[PDB]
Each structure stands twice: as structure tokens, then as C-alpha cells.
Design a protein around this ligand. Structure first.
Ligand SMILES: [Cu+2]
Ligand SMILES: [Cu+2]
Ligand SMILES: [Cu+2]
Ligand SMILES: [Cu+2]
Ligand SMILES: [Cu+2]
Ligand SMILES: [Cu+2]
Lengths: 333, 333, 333
């Protein structure tokens, strides 16, 4: 009887940060309550000032990371305010039935709904909007995020020993298809509704115009670079709701990687680069051993450095010359 | 001595159905006899009435699923009737030597041939036509299918315990490259031979115009939706002879998945989405837990919902509110 | 103290061949010394005579395969002669810190540098140039290769038993983006520097014009086909620094495959085709069982047979009719 279970309310945070949670469950199963408000909004996605009409869960691209444990119930209150113009819903890849919840969560502007589902499978999973007839348009306008369902006894390595992270970040990667005119300039629009047939044409090229982390070119750089210290254990959850990606930590590795994100499987060890298929979330665990700047990229390097799929870590601490050193610094001959 | 072995003749069925077979072998090794007749034919592949000159094994796209057991011999009589115009052959990825059989099976119109090979490796495998100099044109005109080589003791999970399916379906996914004129309309042709240089140009874009299950947009919907009941164990074999795909059962999971299709490896558990590389067959096992409509898609959602790579399951049975429920149905605030 | 370790100097060879090494380490940890000279040079990449300005490590596309053992130190002297025009550096995916060495190895024409790093993780790994602001242009001009870090006790199968190869080859796969004019002809250039904005435009299409093994269409055919004998155990290392590939041995299999190339993981067995993500090296082990010609391809067959990603093995020895035979040779009805 679900009414006898504890309820706990989560207050979400903006990506790439993740709300507070316990890796090993400190209670029995709970109903974990979340609220998200859909926001259609203009977003500037690149250095040139290209502006799109984004569709968001909770104001961000990606939507926030939700965290529960296996066999918890997730109860989501989904709000579509009357300041929006479109019908929306939500499909959780973590859930079982009704198109992942999509069939039960159709909300017009001015409506809300509450969905409950049991988190029966541990892993990181995509969630996304999926309104009948409009699915890729909503997804590729930014309306996707992820949910992490931890095993009740936390993460384990390939031998069944505990893995405990000190820090966690969520990197949502988004493919955008901004319509272009024959000369190649982006076509701008006043409303989200304006784009439709041109949005379909741009998508059908299968060639994104931008591929970004956390909603914009350079979002995870500068003052917004990810941080860690030498010796810290970091889990990076990465999702892509529509298109394959291949993450790589330049200067590091994925020490333990669940490329397709499901924790009942042993992790792959010592990865340089890993493939996360479109429609999937994956997770990589790394212990930093060197200080300095690292680039975290999609290792199609065109997609990274021309189209936007690159972020930075800034790592503090002690340099280890046994691991790497310049024997003879660049100089003339 | 092969002449001392039992011979058994299989009568193939049209995809997505699969001919009768036993999961656990009830006899010793056999010579399993198959016959396929090549058919070049016009096919209408979309709702708009786009017509291509398809090249088929046995009249269908994909070709039918063949099923044997490890260490059986497959004996295929391949018939190219004189009503066809092109030379064809067959490459089995399950086979060892002679380009998978391609070098030994070149048949002009009005010829036939019989190939035998030993099925030494268990798994699902692609087969396709591959005539020298014309390989991608034949493959992307529909001339591919798959073969399943079951272990003699059937399928096993990651712990070595039996997995038994109640139903099996074969989903062949096909990328088509219909030539277009400068304005973007499809160029139509009277003969298969007509297309050649324009077919090459269209392929070189690396951008399919259509991506379909079972030969056409909407083929696995309506009266032709896949079916199951709550509690049934279903194996879905999925192939793509030329291009990567990422299957996903919307509202379900792959409980056990062999993404690259080879049964001596343990399955991956609890997949949301899995990558089947081009030139590979994969297999996913799921036990249905909820009734209703499910969408089975390539989770590049553009490829699914714009280009055609989507089918449906219709599932009968009892709804489980513990797994999912609408707490508050969509309503105004 | 590194100064107390043996030093051993390696003399590299041109791909697809690999310098001499021992699978099981016959010494303790060593400093393994390598020298590479950067060469910007014109290369003809196809049958039509298309000429690009390539950027190479040691004169070849790919750069040579380096081979060490786990916990060796790699010491690379990297030379940028004053006959080149561009700044270059090197990022080793095998290394830890400083962008894989990229931050410590920036050499202008007329400079050299010496980098040392400890090879802490066993596997095959990509290395590539990566100068700030110019990364995909250098990589897709050919400036990448791979390094193999063998476990000190050699390779093992999925049960922990030894796997010993008799022959090893290195197949580097390169995506090129040759700029085209509006009519579709390649734009030619006098200097590497000439291309820049047009190179960026061509890359942003995400559609390579050529995809080649060992630097050119047909490079691994004819007198330069790979060779083996029936019964020989062959390891094929395959890298792709920028874009996904899906290798397949037509007429064979990958008996043991590390698709993402990291030897602490068990291999996948009996693969038909495997996905190596862009930015990764992988390795496949096969024992040949049949003589004749095999085609080794990227199994996007358009990429293989139209764009150039195909090579051949020529295999000597005895045909096994139990594995495959023509029962009835192609003939009329
Ligand atoms: Cu929406
Ligand atoms: Cu989905
Ligand atoms: Cu054919
Ligand atoms: Cu093939
Ligand atoms: Cu360079
Ligand atoms: Cu790299």
C-alpha cells in the first residue's frame, strides 16, 4: 500500500549540478516527489547570437537530473503554465507502460498532471517530451533530461566492490537543427509555432547546426567550468535523447564506464572514449590524478570544436611527474 | 560424412514472422535445407506513393529469417529467375570463407545455385547480396535479411540460466537513398538498371531519404502491428545491413540484449536503447508487464518519426497500477 | 627513479606493419624511446588523382603504431622541421594529464620537444595532433595514429587463458573532407594554409568525401594486400580518431574483439561486425580457417565501396569443404 510509505519532496537544481541524494539508501522505499514547470523560452545558443525558441523542463536545456533509488516510486507533478503555447507531455525511459508515461501526461497550456511510476530498473535513463505527431521537434528543441535510479546499495565495480563518488555532474548534450535559407544563414522566428514545416525540413537533413552541452556553445567553460581536485572521484552522467555521441575526457579516461547506463551490468574499464547511443544516458567514473584544465568532448572533433560539444574541467592540486613530464621543453634545433 | 545426416526442409515465412523451430535442439546436427527465389519488383515505400525498384530475397524487404542450430549445416538453393535483369549472389555473415558465400553464389537471370555451409558460431547474423562492384546498391535496394544460429541448448541469461521466448519477431530496418532532383523531388525510374549513376550519387550523400521497418513506412502498424500479452516473453531480432541503428521499445526495455547479436557473450541487462552497428543483427528479450500500445523505434527520433523507422506493439492484458498510474489526470489549475 | 631503468630505442615502421615487440614482457619496466618527425606533404588519395595537403606523423597516414607494455614509460622525441609551415603537437589518449601531452608538446617549425609519460592502462589508444583552435582540421588532415599498451603477461581471452597472435596489422581509417565547389568538384590548393575557412565549411557538413585505410583508396589491395595463412592467428588493430566505424572481415569474424580497445575487459566473442567509436582504437583477433581473398571493410557499405574504406587479405592454404562448399555450381534451369 503506497499510502503507508514515506513521502520525500525533492527540490531540483539546474544542470550541470545535481540535487542532494544518498548513494547508499538510508531509508526503505519512498515516494519521491518532484515538480517541474514547462517553459517555452528564447535561448541564445552560440557566440554569434543565434536565438531559438526552446522548449524546456524547468527552464533549462537539459532538464534537471532526478535521482532516486531502485524500487522507489517517482511522483512527478508536471505543470504547463498558460503562458506557453504548446501541448507537452513526458516519457520516462525508466518507467514501464503507457509510452513511458507519455500517454498519461498530455497537458495543454493551463493544465497540470501528476504521474507516479515505480523505478524498477537501476541505471541512468533519458526522459523527454513526446507529443503525438511532434516528437522529434520537441526533443530537438531541448525538451529532454535524465533520471538516475541508483541501486539501493550504491554503485559497484566489475568485481562487486563499492564505488563511491565524491562529486557528480550531469552533462546533457543537445543536437539543434536551426533552419537555414539557401545561402546558409539561420532563419529567425517570433514564436515557437512559426517554425514547423521548416523545422521538419531542417531535421530531415540529419545534420545538426549546433551540438551543445548545457544548452549553449561554451556553457561549461570559464566561470562555469566543471571543477575537481586531484584525488577526487567524479561521476559524469551524460545523455543524448536523439543522436549518438562519444564522450572523451581529454587528458583522462573513463576508469569505469556504463556506456549504455545500466548498473546491473559490470562497467567497462579504462575507456578512452565510449559510445552513448541516441536515446540513452550513460555514466563514467574517473579519479583525477593530475591538475590543470581538461576538455570533456564529443570525440567527433568537428562536433566538439566546430559545432559546440566541448566543456572544461578545472582541476586543482599537485602535478605528478612520474605520470607525465616534459623532458625537453619545445625549443629550436 | 554429411550424407549420413538427417535432412530437414524448411518452408520460410514472410517477416516479421519466423518459421517454426525448436529453441533447444531435439535432434543431433542436421542439414537444414532452404530455398529462396530472388525477385526484382516495384515497391511503394511511403504514404506519398514513392515507388522504387527493390531487389529482394523471396519477395520481401527484409528477406526472411532463417533459423538453425549451432553446428547444423545450412544448405541454400538460391534461384534467380529469368524474369529478373541483374546478377545476384549471397553473403552470409554466419559463414566462413569465400566472402561469406558471395564468391560461390553468383547467379545470372535464369540460373540457380546450391551453397552449403556449417553454422559454427551461435548468434543472429546479417545476410545480403554483394555482387562485385555493385554491393551497396543491391544492399540498399532491400537485398538483405538475417539468419539466427541458436545454441543447441537454447538461450541463456548472464548467470547461465535458461531464457525461453514465447514469441519471436524479425524487424529488418532498411535505409533507402531515393534520388532527388535539385528541387528535392524523387526521380522515378522504369527499370532497376535505369538508376545507376544517380543511385551512386544519392548513396554518397550518406543521408537516407527513408528508413523503414519491414519495407515501408507504417508497415508494422494497424492490422500489421506486432502483438503480445502481458506476461509473454518476446524476442525481437533486429538487423541493419548498412547503417547503425538504436532500437528502443517505448514504454518498455530490453531486459536482456545482445546488441551485436552473438550468444556466447552474456546479454546486457535492462537496456533503454542499444546500438546495432551497420552490418549487424542484434536481439532483445523482453517480458511484457503492461498492456496497451508500445512504439518500437530507432531512437534517432527524426529517423523514427520523420523518415519511417517506427512500428507498434499492441499488448493485451491487465494494467498494473503499482508500476504506473495517473495520480491526477491532466486538468486545469 | 626513472634514471635507473633500462632505455630501449624503437625504430618505427610504416603502417600497416608494426615494429618488433614481445607480447609477454621479457624485461621489467623500461623507458621506451620513440622519435617521430612531422611531415606536411601532398598526398594523392583516390583513383581520380585528388590531391590534398596532408599533415603526418612520420610521413604516413595513419602515423605508425607504437607498442609498449603496461607500466613502461614512453619517451617521445617529436620533431617539427623548418620545412613545415604549421604549429603541431601530440595528444596521447594513453596518457594522463596536460591534455594527453598536447599542452606540453607545442612545436613550431624548427623546434622539437621530448615528452615522457607512464603507460598506466593497457589497451590500444588513439594519438593525434590537437593545436588550440585547429584541432579537427589537423586530425582530419591525417595527423593521428595509435599506441598499443600490452599487459605485461600478454593478451587473455574471456576465461583468462592466453591469446597469442602470430601476425599483427594496424589499419588506420581516415575521414577526409575535401572542399567542393557548388557543382561538386574538389577545390585544389597550393599550400596547407590556403584551405582554412573552406576546410571548416567542408567539415561542418559532417559528410566525408573520402574514407580510406592507410591513406588512400585501394592502399591495402594488390601487392599491398594484407596476408596470412590458414591456421594463423592475426590481430588487427583499427583506429578512427574522429568518426565512428564498424569493421567487418568479409568471409570471417572477429573471434575475440575489444571494440573499444581496452584489455582489462573481457573480449566480445564471435563478432560479425563491431563498432569502434570516433576517438577510439579497437582490436580484433581471428584465426583464419579458409584460404582466398577476404575484404576487410567499414560495414557502412557506401563508406566501404564508394568512399574507400575497404582493404583485402590474401590467405594461403587448404580449402575446408566441411565449413563451406558449392553443392551445385551456378548453372541454368
Ligand atoms: Cu514538449
Ligand atoms: Cu524515448
Ligand atoms: Cu542482388
Ligand atoms: Cu556484409
Ligand atoms: Cu598538427
Ligand atoms: Cu582525442
Amino acid at each position: 500500500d503506497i499510502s503507508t510509505l514515506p513521502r520525500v519532496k525533492v527540490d531540483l537544481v539546474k544542470p550541470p549540478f545535481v540535487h542532494a541524494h544518498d548513494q547508499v539508501a538510508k531509508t526503505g522505499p519512498r515516494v519521491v516527489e518532484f515538480t517541474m514547470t514547462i517553459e517555452e523560452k528564447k535561448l541564445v545558443i552560440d557566440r554569434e547570437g543565434t536565438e531559438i525558441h526552446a522548449m524546456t523542463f524547468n527552464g533549462s536545456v537539459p532538464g534537471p537530473l532526478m535521482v532516486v533509488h531502485e524500487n522507489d516510486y517517482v511522483e512527478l507533478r508536471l505543470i504547463n503554465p498558460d503562458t506557453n503555447t504548446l501541448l507537452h507531455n513526458i516519457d520516462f525511459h525508466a518507467a514501464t507502460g503507457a509510452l513511458g508515461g507519455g500517454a498519461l501526461t498530455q497537458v495543454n497550456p493551463g493544465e497540470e498532471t501528476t504521474l507516479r511510476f515505480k523505478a524498477t530498473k537501476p541505471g541512468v535513463f533519458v526522459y523527454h517530451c513526446a507529443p503525438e505527431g511532434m516528437v522529434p521537434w520537441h526533443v530537438t528543441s531541448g525538451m529532454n533530461g535524465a533520471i538516475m535510479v541508483l541501486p539501493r546499495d550504491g554503485l559497484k565495480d566489475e568485481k562487486g566492490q563499492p564505488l563511491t563518488y565524491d562529486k557528480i555532474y550531469y552533462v546533457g548534450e543537445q543536437d539543434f537543427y536551426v533552419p537555414k535559407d539557401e545561402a546558409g544563414n539561420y532563419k529567425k522566428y517570433e514564436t515557437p509555432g512559426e517554425a514547423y514545416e521548416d523545422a521538419v525540413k531542417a531535421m530531415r537533413t540529419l545534420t545538426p547546426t549546433h551540438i551543445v552541452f548545457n544548452g549553449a556553445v561554451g556553457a561549461l567553460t570559464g566561470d562555469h567550468a566543471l571543477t575537481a581536485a586531484v584525488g577526487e572521484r567524479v561521476l559524469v552522467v551524460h545523455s543524448q535523447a536523439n543522436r549518438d555521441t562519444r564522450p572523451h575526457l581529454i587528458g583522462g579516461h573513463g576508469d569505469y564506464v556504463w556506456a549504455t547506463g545500466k548498473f546491473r551490468n559490470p562497467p567497462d574499464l579504462d575507456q578512452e572514449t565510449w559510445l552513448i547511443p541516441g536515446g540513452t544516458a550513460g555514466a563514467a567514473f574517473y579519479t583525477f590524478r593530475q591538475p590543470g584544465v581538461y576538455a570533456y568532448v564529443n570525440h567527433n572533433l568537428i562536433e566538439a570544436f566546430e559545432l559546440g560539444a566541448a566543456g572544461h574541467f578545472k582541476v586543482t592540486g599537485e602535478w605528478n611527474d612520474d605520470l607525465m613530464t616534459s623532458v625537453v621543453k619545445p625549443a629550436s634545433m
